[PDB]
Enzyme design. Structure first.
Site, PDB file in Angstrom:
ATOM      1  N   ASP A 259       0.971  -1.347  -0.017  1.00 39.77           N
ATOM      2  CA  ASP A 259      -0.008   0.051   0.181  1.00 39.77           C
ATOM      3  C   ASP A 259       0.687   1.380   0.064  1.00 39.77           C
ATOM      4  O   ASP A 259       0.484   2.208   0.532  1.00 39.77           O
ATOM      5  CB  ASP A 259      -1.030  -0.019   1.182  1.00 39.77           C
ATOM      6  CG  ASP A 259      -1.695  -1.328   1.396  1.00 39.77           C
ATOM      7  OD1 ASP A 259      -2.476  -1.616   0.221  1.00 39.77           O
ATOM      8  OD2 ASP A 259      -1.864  -1.905   2.333  1.00 39.77           O
ATOM      9  N   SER A 260       2.142   0.996  -0.414  1.00 35.39           N
ATOM     10  CA  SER A 260       2.778   2.487  -0.815  1.00 35.39           C
ATOM     11  C   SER A 260       2.772   2.783  -2.116  1.00 35.39           C
ATOM     12  O   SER A 260       2.303   1.993  -3.086  1.00 35.39           O
ATOM     13  CB  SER A 260       4.242   2.142  -0.406  1.00 35.39           C
ATOM     14  OG  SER A 260       5.112   3.052  -0.553  1.00 35.39           O
TER      15      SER A 260
END
Ligand SMILES: [Zn+2]
Ligand SMILES: [Zn+2]
Ligand SMILES: [Zn+2]
Lengths: 257, 115, 79, 339, 48, 184, 48, 64, 48, 44, 48
Positions: free
Chosen positions: D28-29
């Site tokens: 989720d970066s």
């Protein structure tokens, strides 16, 4: 002595873009060339803003950010100008920077558009490219913008405002003969503008011995430099980086021995 | 708060060497070139030019960390060839190609502009 | 003599022996091992542990209230 | 149309590539384009207002706005009081950093204590407005607005409109980013692994529809229960503009210039910068002030407090067997005392 | 009262003895770094 | 040992958790010493029998020569010793593993070395370890014939309650009732 | 004044955290042993 | 608030095209035609003008 | 649970599956790039 | 200490003792004028 | 358990308290292990 012998074909040359093909190069050299177009071709941009008056609805560093992004003519003066870091003067001088002025007051009922045409340089060689004009801010009656800016040399590796390109299209092997990209369904993919295939076939036959040798470019210019000047400046700048590197490498080799 | 200056990626701070050569003890005729304030621009062309040298056994570069501004180039040559000599020849070949490319691009512009 | 506890040094004894010896070295205690270009007190303690030269006795208290005194050299180090 | 979202938008349309580029968008970066950020992409202003009131209450006790001299006033701090004007108020257009005094307030001592307002330590902005007036109580009232420009950094949160939030893991320049044959680089790269488990298919459709909208020149309609819009219909429209009908494009590695073997799903997606910025959350403590009741580190980032070493951390260190470190955290680093 | 101060999660025992706030601690957002070792942590210069 | 195992595992499940991976250790020995499975082995079958007997004495969990210590030592390593004997048996060392004398001597050393590393360290806070080991899974358990399960069931076990939420009784039929639905 | 800056054995210098410093690095809730693990500090130029 | 000077993606100048873009829309041009007339071919640049909201016009209504 | 607590994750796990497929072939230049990122590499290029 | 009125935009000199109020229209909300000190902005 | 044709060796209760009062502390020790093992291993999770 294993240098390449590149050939250049310029397909289209306008005031905004230069379209050309390089053949007989390695992919690394072709990629490093486009990569220098964007990041290491110096131009002149505003990097120092001092706002004396700002009654506009945009805060001070909003305005400064816009002024930095305004392209300035850099075709020949950029080579003469020194990097302010390298220059031996004080903060700024005519040999490392270009002074700019902006003094707009709105007193009419009609909205006053502060554009790049309102930026006045102390050197005729460095002016906003538009002189429609780029809009800096819109002024209401009774609002004023009074600032002075210094434009200095720089390249895109530092800030995108010194990037002289408006998009560098780079392509090779348009028919995918090398299969550097594998299409799950090749029939679904539009043909490249440089594709030499017929309408019936979607991929060129695989070439086991093939290598990327021909590279297509479309260097669009923001306006600070002519598109052909960007390419030449990149080629000389990339050569400068290598020649500068070899000078350091020569000292290191000599120092060790 | 911790943003490095933008110029830090291409300017050497005082006391920093642009390039340093370290012999590779693992295998013979192998050296590691640590170049400061360089990125994939020079790393890729130097690596690809070295791979064109038949006397270079191994040529490779890496950016150890994107937030850092170092490239490490590892060159291994044959016993009769030095990695340093391969590195210098690679740059001269690159400089010759770029200089030739500049001349042929200028001619192309003149031909296109003329007609 | 008459020791029932393990002949091996436990991970907890290794952690405290190294940490305790490092502080002693950091406080200018004589180094029992020969060091070459080593200045970190914690790395020096590791060399002494490997050389079995740490001048520390581990006293293992048994549940019944008695204890066994082991020299760090006597115990078998995990490495 | 009825939420006035067009009139007051809360995001930017971003060229988003769903690709595994360098591992800096995993879990989720997000990878952001440094060059796009240099052009004002998701640049934002943080405005913070400080209100101070001078009130006289008591037989001889009063508060006033003035510059507190280190000799005249009893209370004092290591901050800087030079910015304050003669009337005890900082002026607009003055750069202020952490440990700077924006309001000079002195309360007469029963010579006079210092109650001056200190700018937030992390905050580093420019005084925007200094409003002075009378509050509801009739006392002199000053509000000071400090303006700080927030350029998207590593660690700033960004979300699409489909629950796909993520901090910026790294920022690459334009040349480092992957590019299409047209020279388009993504403004944002999100990991493909965010889609499968989350099943945010609306994110993929919006990207496909966004590509058609930008090429066609028409704002796309994504009203939920609309049979007039289908993925196949959107895909057919995209084909008409010279793009792969499923939104994939051949991308070239920016570091090497080589075509990526897999074609990358890329297109315009509306992202939004979230209030949560790393520079507002980064906090470090090294022997700060302690609270009066317990003589332990203060609480809160704004108070330079310490992080809590709670029971769960205490239980964790017991399982580790780190008795001495447990003693450091719970005795030496919190409130060492002698009786 | 005194009894209220000692009991509960935020009480004297659980809130100030079994757990407490500590010096020499830092907190910030975490982002990926595939170029670090599994046993490394990248730390801002301001925290350092 | 076979009959002892049948009592320990009446269900016949041969999957167990033991300190040293003997099959992989043998595989390591074959690669380290370049054992050729096709050629005849130079490892005497008696050396296998004697070697394993000597090894078993070295793997000590309850030291002491008194009968109480000897019995606990026998019980503590009963399962491993059965596994060790049924893996390092002379028949199998000559039939499939084909280890040489040098490889077998190395194998005995590894089992002793890896077994000693497996012994619990004094000072280990095993209670805290157990609490976290049985608590961490609880964070992934769901909440709610039907029988209570997951976190709500875990509470009933540790909050031992006079009245369970879903009391049940599994009855196994003894005689012909088990195999006859009508009689059941 | 350099006289007070002169160091002698037995003095302690509270130096800044540097590369290789051992730290405990924790994510809440701390549910098991791996919720708190030791890390070697690496200094990188951003705020996360 | 105001039209960005450059396209965020490629850096093409778009801050001199907002007034022209508005004028073309006044001339009965479709948004796609107006963008084509202005030379914005890449959909990154078309995104800039097609999705721009000119709030500075609202801000000018408030007296300074 | 007498097993590793950390393993290979999103990108590396998805890519290592692709990488170890039977039909993945790497050219001389590609291989030399990968070995630059192998800290334990002995420096000897294996026979293709 | 010049103060711009929040309504009629009239620069007013108010000391630390006299009340804060517009000279002309009597408005009670004043704004400090921009500092004469000039801040340098990098156009980045 | 006392009922005819009911196996008194394997017949078991999931109620821990019933096991304790009928079979003893060691039986409930084993029953408690089996019941706790059931909840842990119900979803395939394994604990040593
Ligand atoms: Zn100068
Ligand atoms: Zn664009
Ligand atoms: Zn007024």
């Amino acid at each position: 002595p294993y240098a390449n012998q590149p050939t250049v074909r310029i397909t289209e040359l306008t005031d905004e873009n230069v379209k050309f093909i390089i053949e007989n190069t390695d992919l690394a050299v072709a990629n490093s060339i486009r990569r220098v177009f964007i990041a290491e071709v110096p131009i002149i941009a505003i990097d120092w803003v001092q706002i004396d008056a700002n009654s506009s609805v945009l805060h001070d560093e909003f305005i400064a950010h816009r002024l930095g992004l305004i392209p300035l003519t850099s075709d020949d003066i950029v080579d003469k100008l020194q990097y302010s870091r390298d220059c031996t003067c004080e903060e700024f001088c005519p040999e490392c920077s270009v002074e700019f002025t902006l003094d707009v007051r709105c007193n009419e009922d009609q909205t006053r558009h502060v554009t790049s045409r309102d930026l006045i340089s102390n050197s005729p060689r460095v002016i906003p490219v538009t002189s429609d004009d780029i809009l800096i801010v819109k002024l209401r009656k009774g609002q004023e913008l009074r600032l002075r800016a210094y434009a200095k040399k720089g390249f895109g590796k530092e800030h995108a405002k010194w990037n002289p390109t408006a998009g560098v299209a780079f392509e090779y092997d348009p028919d995918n003969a090398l299969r550097h990209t594998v299409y799950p369904k090749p029939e679904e993919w539009p043909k490249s503008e440089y594709s030499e295939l017929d309408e019936d076939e979607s991929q060129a036959p695989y070439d086991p011995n093939g290598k990327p040798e021909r590279f297509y470019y479309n260097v669009e210019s923001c306006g600070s430099l002519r598109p052909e000047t960007i390419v030449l400046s990149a080629l000389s700048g990339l050569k400068k980086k290598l020649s500068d590197l070899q000078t350091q490498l020569s000292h290191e080799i000599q120092s060790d021995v | 708060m911790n943003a490095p200056p933008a110029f830090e990626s291409f300017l050497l701070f005082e006391g920093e060497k642009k390039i340093t050569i370290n012999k590779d003890t693992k295998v013979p005729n192998a050296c590691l070139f640590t170049i400061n304030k360089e990125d994939h621009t020079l790393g890729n062309i130097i690596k690809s030019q070295l791979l064109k040298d038949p006397q270079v056994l191994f040529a490779g570069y890496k950016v150890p960390h994107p937030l850092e501004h170092k490239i490490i180039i590892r060159v291994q040559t044959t016993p009769d060839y030095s990695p340093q000599e391969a590195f210098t020849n690679a740059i001269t070949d690159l400089i010759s190609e770029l200089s030739l490319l500049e001349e042929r691009f200028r001619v192309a512009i003149k031909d296109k502009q003329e007609g | 003599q008459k020791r029932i506890t393990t002949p091996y040094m436990t991970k907890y004894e290794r952690a405290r022996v190294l940490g305790t010896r490092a502080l002693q070295i950091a406080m200018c205690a004589p180094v029992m091992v020969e060091l070459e270009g080593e200045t970190d007190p914690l790395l020096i303690a590791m060399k002494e542990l490997k050389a079995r030269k740490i001048p520390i006795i581990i006293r293992r208290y048994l549940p019944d209230g008695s204890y066994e005194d082991w020299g760090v050299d006597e115990l078998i180090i995990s490495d | 149309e009825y939420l006035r979202f067009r009139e007051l938008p809360a995001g930017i349309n971003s060229i988003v590539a769903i690709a595994s580029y360098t591992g800096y968008n995993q879990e989720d970066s997000v990878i952001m384009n440094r060059s796009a950020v240099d052009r004002g992409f998701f640049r934002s202003v943080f405005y913070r207002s400080y209100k101070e009131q001078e009130s006289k209450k008591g037989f001889d006790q009063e508060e006033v706005f003035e510059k507190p001299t280190r000799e005249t006033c009893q209370g004092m701090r290591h901050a800087i009081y030079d910015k304050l004007d003669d009337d005890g108020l900082i002026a607009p257009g003055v750069r202020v950093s952490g440990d700077d005094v924006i309001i000079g307030k002195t309360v007469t001592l029963p010579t006079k204590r210092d109650c001056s307002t200190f700018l937030r330590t992390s905050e580093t902005g420019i005084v925007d407005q200094v409003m002075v007036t009378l509050n509801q109580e009739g006392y002199k009232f000053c509000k000071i607005r400090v303006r700080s420009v927030r350029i998207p950094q590593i660690g700033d949160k960004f979300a699409s409109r489909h629950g796909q939030k993520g901090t910026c893991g790294i920022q690459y320049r334009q040349e480092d980013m992957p590019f299409t044959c047209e020279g388009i680089t993504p403004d944002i790269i999100i990991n493909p692994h965010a889609i499968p488990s989350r099943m945010t298919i609306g994110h993929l459709i919006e990207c496909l529809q966004g590509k058609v909208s930008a090429n066609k020149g028409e704002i796309g309609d994504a009203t939920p229960f609309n049979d007039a819009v289908n993925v196949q219909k959107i895909s057919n429209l995209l084909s008409d503009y010279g793009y792969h009908l499923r939104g994939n494009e051949v991308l070239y590695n920016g570091f090497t210039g080589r075509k990526i073997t897999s074609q990358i799903f890329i297109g315009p997606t509306y992202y939004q910068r979230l209030k949560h910025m790393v520079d507002d959350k980064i906090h470090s403590r090294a022997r700060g002030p302690i609270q009066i009741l317990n003589r332990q580190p203060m609480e809160g980032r704004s108070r330079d407090g310490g992080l809590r070493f709670g029971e769960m951390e205490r239980d964790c260190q017991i399982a580790h067997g780190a008795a001495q470190f447990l003693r450091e955290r719970l005795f030496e680093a919190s409130d060492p005392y002698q009786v | 009262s005194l009894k209220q101060r000692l009991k509960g999660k935020e009480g004297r025992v659980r809130g100030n003895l079994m757990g407490k706030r500590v010096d020499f601690s830092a907190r910030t957002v975490i982002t990926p770094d595939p170029n670090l070792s599994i046993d490394q942590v990248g730390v801002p210069r301001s925290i350092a | 040992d076979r009959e002892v195992l049948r009592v320990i595992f009446p269900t016949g499940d041969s999957k167990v958790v033991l300190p040293c991976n003997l099959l992989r250790m043998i595989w390591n020995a074959q690669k380290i010493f370049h054992i050729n499975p096709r050629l005849p082995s130079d490892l005497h079958p008696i050396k296998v029998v004697e070697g394993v007997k000597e090894l078993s004495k070295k793997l000590v969990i309850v030291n002491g020569d008194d009968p109480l210590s000897r019995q606990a030592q026998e019980n503590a390593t009963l399962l491993f010793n059965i596994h060790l004997r049924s893996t390092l048996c002379s028949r199998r060392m000559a039939e499939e593993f084909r280890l040489s004398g040098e490889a077998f001597d190395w194998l005995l050393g590894e089992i002793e070395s890896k077994f000693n590393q497996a012994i619990a360290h004094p000072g280990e806070m095993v209670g805290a370890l157990a609490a976290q080991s049985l608590g961490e899974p609880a964070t992934q358990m769901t909440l709610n014939k039907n029988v209570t399960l997951g976190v709500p069931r875990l509470k009933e076990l540790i909050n031992i309650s006079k009245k369970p939420k879903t009391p049940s009784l599994t009855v196994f039929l003894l005689g012909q009732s088990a195999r006859d639905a009508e009689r059941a | 004044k350099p006289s007070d800056l002169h160091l002698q054995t037995g003095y302690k210098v509270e130096r800044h955290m540097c590369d290789g410093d051992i730290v405990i690095f924790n994510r809440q809730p701390t549910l098991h042993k791996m919720s708190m693990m030791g890390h070697r500090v690496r200094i990188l130029p951003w705020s996360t | 608030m105001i039209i960005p000077v450059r396209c965020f993606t490629c850096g093409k100048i778009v801050g001199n095209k907002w007034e022209a873009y508005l004028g073309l829309l006044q001339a009965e041009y479709t948004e796609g035609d107006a963008l084509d007339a202005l030379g914005l071919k890449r959909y990154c640049c078309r995104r800039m003008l097609l999705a721009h909201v000119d709030l500075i016009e609202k801000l000018l209504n408030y007296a300074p | 649970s007498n097993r590793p607590v950390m393993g290979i994750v999103q990108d590396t796990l998805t890519a290592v599956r692709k990488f170890t497929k039977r039909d993945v072939f790497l050219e001389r230049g590609e291989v030399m790039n990968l070995l630059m990122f192998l800290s334990t590499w002995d420096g000897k290029v294996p026979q293709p | 200490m010049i103060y711009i009125c929040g309504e009629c935009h009239t620069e007013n000199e108010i000391k630390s003792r006299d009340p804060i109020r517009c000279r002309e229209c009597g408005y009670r909300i004043m704004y400090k004028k921009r500092t004469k000190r000039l801040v340098v902005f990098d156009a980045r | 358990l006392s009922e005819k044709d009911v196996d008194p060796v394997r017949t078991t209760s999931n109620d821990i308290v019933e096991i304790f009062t009928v079979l003893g502390i060691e039986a409930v020790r084993k029953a408690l292990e089996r019941e706790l093992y059931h909840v842990i291993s119900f979803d395939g999770s394994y604990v040593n």
